[PDB]
Structure 1
Amino acid sequence: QTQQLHAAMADTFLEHMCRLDIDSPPITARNTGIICTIGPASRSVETLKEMIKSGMNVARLNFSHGTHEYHAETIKNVRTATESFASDPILYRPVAVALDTKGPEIRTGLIAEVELKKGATLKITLDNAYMEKCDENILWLDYKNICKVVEVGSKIYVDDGLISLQVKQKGADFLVTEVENGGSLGSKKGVNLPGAAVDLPAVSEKDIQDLKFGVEQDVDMVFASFIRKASDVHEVRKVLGEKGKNIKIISKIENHEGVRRFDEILEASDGIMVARGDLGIEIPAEKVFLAQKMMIGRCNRAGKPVICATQMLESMIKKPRPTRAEGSDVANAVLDGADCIMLSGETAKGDYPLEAVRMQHLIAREAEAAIYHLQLFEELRRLAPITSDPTEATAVGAVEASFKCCSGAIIVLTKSGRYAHQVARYRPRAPIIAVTRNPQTARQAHLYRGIFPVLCKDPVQEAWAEDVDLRVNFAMNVGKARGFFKKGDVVIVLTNTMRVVPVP
């Protein structure tokens, strides 16, 4: 009657859908990590504390804007808000910090707003003299090489793809275009060139410094913008270097080349972001769902984290409740298989950042119950390579056992996080309580569906079995406290050993 267990028992997907029940309450635990972009509306310590309480797991810093000093301060406030809960390690929630690079962006100059009208002429110039004199006649932008990569007849998008132009003529140092989709044009707006092979560096001089700064600031992960190919990833990896070797690189797929070359990018990366914002300008908007499902499926297949991003609850920037399309989008990203879901303007600058976060937590939890685990697990089994790795055997063994005895959690003791990632990849219904003494492991674990990281602060006990018992008992106290399970329930414990344990 709870957790859509009646639907879970259906023998066909169609019957599974038919049994979905709005009156069947979800379990307390929410498995899908929530990533929040931080900015004006959410940067204060006090607001940050509330965002943690509402469900924020990862703080995203968008380096397309802001100075190092501005971001260092954000990072400082995140940690302050986060450590304000550190006194009770049973209820302390780790919070990750993610650095999202600028990457090979193209931006217009400074206009004030001008109205671009359908059919009108607009000249694109590179002449720095017009750098701050952008108007409805002449538009400067910062991609000096633009004329060498675009052709006559090709389209240029400006401002989240809302304004569109067609290249009509190529001048010596300029482009002559005609407005197709008009609208009001502001300053320093994003420009996209679908069909063009932009030859900006995968990692610019600015990107290099931003990455280095990330290392200095001990960030947990990097969201690398406009990744086109494995070599782009390698450059990011080399820049993070030895000091940042444990920082996870999440490649953002935002253009056609990234999709085409997805497999090599995935192999090189620690995870993927479906960056629907740019992607849905670079390719036709009606095709984005295809790329999203393809990437989520392939990440699920490979056991690597995948993030669904951009415009998930967009209207909530201005309103306290989302649209029905938005409710559906979050649910479907989760049903698709997304490890995490993301908020951008909704939390960075919107008027209801707390409600946005809470709505993502609510929808995700409902959606997680509605997953058809019977089929998903069967298929993950079949598609999983038969190998000799014993930790891999234990992981699937534990997940199988968790479905059988309908356990309240799988408790995993992990140093690097790997052991727990191996369990997550099989997508158990039961929450995975990953107990670790490594603070970075705890933060980064949020990247994986189902992992609820807890940070053990007790010293290592001399006797191994006592040290194990200490950590498992910790996990038990967390589960009871958070209402995941209670005395007398049954949980699976992984330490290579799997034990099925009654909760005290």
Structure 2
Amino acid sequence: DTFLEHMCRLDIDSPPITARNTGIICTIGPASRSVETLKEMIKSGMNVARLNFSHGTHEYHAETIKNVRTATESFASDPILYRPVAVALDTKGPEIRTGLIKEVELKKGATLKITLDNAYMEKCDENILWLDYKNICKVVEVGSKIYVDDGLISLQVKQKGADFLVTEVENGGSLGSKKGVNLPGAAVDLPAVSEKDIQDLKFGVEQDVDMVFASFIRKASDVHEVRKVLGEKGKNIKIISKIENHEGVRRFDEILEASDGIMVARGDLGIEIPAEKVFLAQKMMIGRCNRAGKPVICATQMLESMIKKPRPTRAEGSDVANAVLDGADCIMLSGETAKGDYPLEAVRMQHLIAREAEAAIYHLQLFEELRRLAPIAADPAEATAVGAVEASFKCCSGAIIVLTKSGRSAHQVARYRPRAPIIAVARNPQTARQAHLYRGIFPVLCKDPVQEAWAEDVDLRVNFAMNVGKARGFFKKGDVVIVLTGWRPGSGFTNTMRVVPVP
């Protein structure tokens, strides 16, 4: 009844009892591409496979996607135990790159002039450096820092020109070729969708991906440019906006209102804004996502140590758990599953931490705040969704069963953070897969034929859900579940709630 008493009763020497409710997203690459590893990653709890289009060809990604689907459909022969697995396309997005040295040393002792003049784009050195961002000179000033190679080189602009910068180095070191630059000042005006991104996104539509992780989102109009490129054929593809610099954090509200969800890229924010502040930015963006009922993913610097070790550090378990407790919907693994020595061990550990963290979630408190921050009255569907969550607490329910076309009704229930799992029963395979983005939704794909009597159809899907719930040990005979259904086909939105005994 008190958060403090929940913390006081935490017991490291008893196994975690509540289900993992947060999604696991795994970057698939060389170490994890193979069908056999992919099957093991699915059984160990991967919900979403991420393809990082910063590297690899279309051919290479097509085969990864084929292995992901082969590994996923290997479990299809049991509809009660089959777990849907979503496919995520993560774009390269806009970059600023230095181009070719003829590496070199660097210290303040010599000033570094930055030039954009294409006749210098292969003769980079400690005296003159080339940059591929033609419009740099408009968006920087004489106070502004310039980070080179993932923040290990910092500069400080002293003379701004029309098409040149005079800097002087801080935090010097070993500058090499084609290194990534960051401008903490920000308001960079690079397109939003690079030439490669438009091809990549078209391939995404053809490969039938469930969602896009759109890199370097700075404003609402970037999200709407990705939407427009995905076009009419891609309109049901979820757009997750990646927040990676200071301007994204500052314009968070317009990006959130434009997006299907959000990814917080902590390592990227680590470069752009001070370390004493990134934790506030993460707690802020997760809170605003929770309030809006929109999925938020925490990404980068999760279990990096597990690229080379089979167990993570104390600090990594704490950072991952504290992301769950901030209210993240999903946690994403990068190199730990893409290229590291322990891909399967990485998935298993992400699972153990997210599950252990559930002990420290106080569900009723999240609900009471989230219910009080809802509109004054809202539509019918909202009143019903909140009513189903309220009922779930007051009957100590095993689950909330939601029959959904698009997932919207399941999504509405999830925003309110019931303790009870949301078993989202869907015939649409894409909405089954997209559902993994949301804390506390367990999607199941009903393949049964559409009955002709609607009340018979509903009864079959609910029976399906009852069977899934029993097999997963969410509940058993004598328990009560909430059920949310539409009324007759002919009406709009799931506006119908029953409290039903588990037969």
| Shorter-chain TM-score above 0.5 | yes
Higher mean displacement: 129-138 or 381-390: 129-138
User: 1:497/1:108 Cα in 2 relative to 1: closer, same or farther (>3 Å)?
Assistant: same
1:22 is displaced (CA, Å) by 2.5
Tell me the residue number matched to 2:293. Answer: 303
- Output the CA distance in 1 between the equivalents of 2:194 and 2:78: 43
Task: Give the match's secondary structure for 1:374.
Answer: helix
1:295 is displaced (CA, Å) by 0.9
User: 1:244/1:435 Cα in 2 relative to 1: closer, same or farther (>3 Å)?
Assistant: same
Structure 1 contact 369–429 (Cα < 8 Å) conserved: no
Once the two structures are superposed, residues 279-335 of structure 1 have per-residue CA deviations (whole angstroms, 9 ceiling, x without a partner) of 221111221111111111111111111111111112112211111111111111111
Higher mean displacement: 475-484 or 214-223: 475-484
- Output the CA distance in 2 between the equivalents of 1:185 and 1:318: 25
User: 1:327/1:73 Cα in 2 relative to 1: closer, same or farther (>3 Å)?
Assistant: same
1:182 is displaced (CA, Å) by 3.2
**Unaligned segments of structure 1, at least 5 residues:** 1-10
Structure 2 contact 102–122 (Cα < 8 Å) conserved: no
User: 1:39/1:178 Cα in 2 relative to 1: closer, same or farther (>3 Å)?
Assistant: farther
User: 1:33/1:374 Cα in 2 relative to 1: closer, same or farther (>3 Å)?
Assistant: same
Structure 1 contact 490–502 (Cα < 8 Å) conserved: yes
- Output the CA distance in 2 between the equivalents of 1:466 and 1:441: 22
User: 1:318/1:179 Cα in 2 relative to 1: closer, same or farther (>3 Å)?
Assistant: farther
- Output the CA distance in 1 between the equivalents of 2:114 and 2:35: 43
- Output the CA distance in 2 between the equivalents of 1:476 and 1:343: 32
User: 1:45/1:189 Cα in 2 relative to 1: closer, same or farther (>3 Å)?
Assistant: farther
Higher mean displacement: 286-295 or 39-48: 39-48
1:155 is displaced (CA, Å) by 1.6
Task: Give the match's secondary structure for 1:115.
Answer: coil
1:114 is displaced (CA, Å) by 4.7
User: 1:173/1:419 Cα in 2 relative to 1: closer, same or farther (>3 Å)?
Assistant: closer
Structure 1 contact 38–59 (Cα < 8 Å) conserved: yes
Tell me the residue number matched to 2:10. Answer: 20
User: 1:167/1:15 Cα in 2 relative to 1: closer, same or farther (>3 Å)?
Assistant: same
Structure 1 contact 162–183 (Cα < 8 Å) conserved: yes
- Output the CA distance in 2 between the equivalents of 1:50 and 1:137: 52
Structure 2 contact 147–183 (Cα < 8 Å) conserved: yes
- Output the CA distance in 2 between the equivalents of 1:47 and 1:124: 46
**Unaligned segments of structure 2, at least 5 residues:** 485-493
The one of 212, 233, 237 aligned to 1:243: 233
User: 1:406/1:133 Cα in 2 relative to 1: closer, same or farther (>3 Å)?
Assistant: farther
The one of 227, 233, 239 aligned to 2:223: 233
Once the two structures are superposed, residues 220-248 of structure 1 have per-residue CA deviations (whole angstroms, 9 ceiling, x without a partner) of 11111121111111111111111111111
User: 1:324/1:111 Cα in 2 relative to 1: closer, same or farther (>3 Å)?
Assistant: farther
Structure 1 contact 396–423 (Cα < 8 Å) conserved: yes
User: 1:140/1:42 Cα in 2 relative to 1: closer, same or farther (>3 Å)?
Assistant: farther
The alignment status of 1:497 with 2:496, answered yes or no, reads: yes
Tell me the residue number matched to 1:159. Answer: 149
- Output the CA distance in 2 between the equivalents of 1:261 and 1:335: 24
Structure 1 contact 28–484 (Cα < 8 Å) conserved: no
The one of 292, 308, 330 aligned to 1:340: 330
Query: Among the aligned pairs, what percent are the same residue?
Result: 99
1:163 is displaced (CA, Å) by 2.6
Aligned length: 494
1:345 is displaced (CA, Å) by 1.5
1:109 is displaced (CA, Å) by 2.5
1:496 is displaced (CA, Å) by 3.2
Higher mean displacement: 469-478 or 183-192: 183-192
Higher mean displacement: 302-311 or 114-123: 114-123
1:501 is displaced (CA, Å) by 2.9
User: 1:264/1:349 Cα in 2 relative to 1: closer, same or farther (>3 Å)?
Assistant: same
Higher mean displacement: 421-430 or 115-124: 115-124
User: 1:318/1:139 Cα in 2 relative to 1: closer, same or farther (>3 Å)?
Assistant: farther
Higher mean displacement: 22-31 or 200-209: 22-31
Once the two structures are superposed, residues 173-202 of structure 1 have per-residue CA deviations (whole angstroms, 9 ceiling, x without a partner) of 544443322344454332101104312112
User: 1:19/1:267 Cα in 2 relative to 1: closer, same or farther (>3 Å)?
Assistant: same
- Output the CA distance in 2 between the equivalents of 1:481 and 1:54: 17
Higher mean displacement: 208-217 or 329-338: 208-217
Task: Give the match's secondary structure for 2:168.
Answer: strand
User: 1:352/1:120 Cα in 2 relative to 1: closer, same or farther (>3 Å)?
Assistant: farther
Once the two structures are superposed, residues 1-38 of structure 1 have per-residue CA deviations (whole angstroms, 9 ceiling, x without a partner) of xxxxxxxxxx4333332232324543353210111122
- Output the CA distance in 1 between the equivalents of 2:347 and 2:124: 37
Structure 2 contact 364–393 (Cα < 8 Å) conserved: no
- TM-score, normalization: structure 1? 0.92
Once the two structures are superposed, residues 78-121 of structure 1 have per-residue CA deviations (whole angstroms, 9 ceiling, x without a partner) of 11111111111111111111111222211232459555457555
Higher mean displacement: 200-209 or 219-228: 200-209
Task: Give the match's secondary structure for 2:72.
Answer: helix
User: 1:196/1:419 Cα in 2 relative to 1: closer, same or farther (>3 Å)?
Assistant: closer
User: 1:154/1:40 Cα in 2 relative to 1: closer, same or farther (>3 Å)?
Assistant: same
Tell me the residue number matched to 1:429. Answer: 419
User: 1:144/1:24 Cα in 2 relative to 1: closer, same or farther (>3 Å)?
Assistant: same
Task: Give the match's secondary structure for 2:416.
Answer: coil
Task: Give the match's secondary structure for 2:276.
Answer: helix
- Output the CA distance in 2 between the equivalents of 1:215 and 1:157: 35
1:172 is displaced (CA, Å) by 7.3
Task: Give the match's secondary structure for 1:133.
Answer: coil
User: 1:347/1:112 Cα in 2 relative to 1: closer, same or farther (>3 Å)?
Assistant: farther
- Output the CA distance in 1 between the equivalents of 2:24 and 2:139: 38
Structure 2 contact 186–246 (Cα < 8 Å) conserved: no
- Output the CA distance in 2 between the equivalents of 1:210 and 1:463: 44
Structure 1 contact 112–186 (Cα < 8 Å) conserved: no
- Output the CA distance in 2 between the equivalents of 1:136 and 1:73: 43
- Output the CA distance in 2 between the equivalents of 1:370 and 1:285: 25
Task: Give the match's secondary structure for 2:105.
Answer: strand
- Output the CA distance in 1 between the equivalents of 2:339 and 2:124: 26
- Output the CA distance in 1 between the equivalents of 2:131 and 2:343: 32
- TM-score, normalization: structure 2? 0.92
1:457 is displaced (CA, Å) by 1.0
Structure 2 contact 18–359 (Cα < 8 Å) conserved: no
Higher mean displacement: 327-336 or 60-69: 60-69
Structure 1 contact 116–136 (Cα < 8 Å) conserved: yes
Higher mean displacement: 434-443 or 33-42: 33-42
